[PDB]
Amino acid sequence: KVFGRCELAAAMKRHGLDNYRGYSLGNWVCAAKFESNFNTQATNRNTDGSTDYGILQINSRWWCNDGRTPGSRNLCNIPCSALLSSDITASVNCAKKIVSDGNGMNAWVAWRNRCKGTDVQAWIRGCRL
Template identity: 50%
Template sequence: MKAAGTLALMGCLITVVEPKIYTRCKLAKIFSRAGLDNYRGFSLGNWICMAYYESHYNTTAQTDLEDGSTDYGIFKINSYTWCRRAKLQEKNHCHVACSDLITDDLTDAIICAKKIVKETEGMNYWQGWKKHCEGKDLSEWKKGCELS
């Protein structure tokens, strides 16, 4: 009886991060409400395009890099500079745990992405954006989405 109760409690404590893959229009609405449209001069299309090429809109996306760091979440934010895993030498400029960047709640990821754009050279931080979105007509990325 005691073992069953312990197992049930352990089951409640274990959290499983299930992938949430947003649709383009759902993300457009979230990004718009979060003030990303024209944030630092970057249209909503830039943000939607970048998120697609970085993570394919997958909130739990992770990529381990050769330098030992990891890119996390829908924006693929790097652990060495922007978030904290467990290593003290990581800079953690966004003052956030990397695990907070791979949840369905995009608040921390958006706040951190804004900080990256503000404190670096705009959206040049993201290779997916530079390769696929920079300098292109991005109006198609929000086409058909009911934005207020």
């Protein structure tokens, strides 16, 4: 599923991401825009053989099991395919574990390079939330 900007904002708010660990909702929408272009089915292979999955591009080296990343962890206790669903619940719940891990949203390279320090509130402007 390809979400609209305000549709995704509303779904993320319903799942408790607004101000989660101090990150306002616009940070999460901005991260999703640049990680996946709002597409739940996005996948991308990394040089180390791991793969990133879903709207927040969660990586199989640590967070989910895809059966083809030897020596990796599955800290969210989910198959990586669950992160591609049109229902964002699994992605949100796993993202909450990632952002609590110590480095905050710096875990998402696109957030660090394209959202951090910008006017992230623009990503939720005009939305009925």
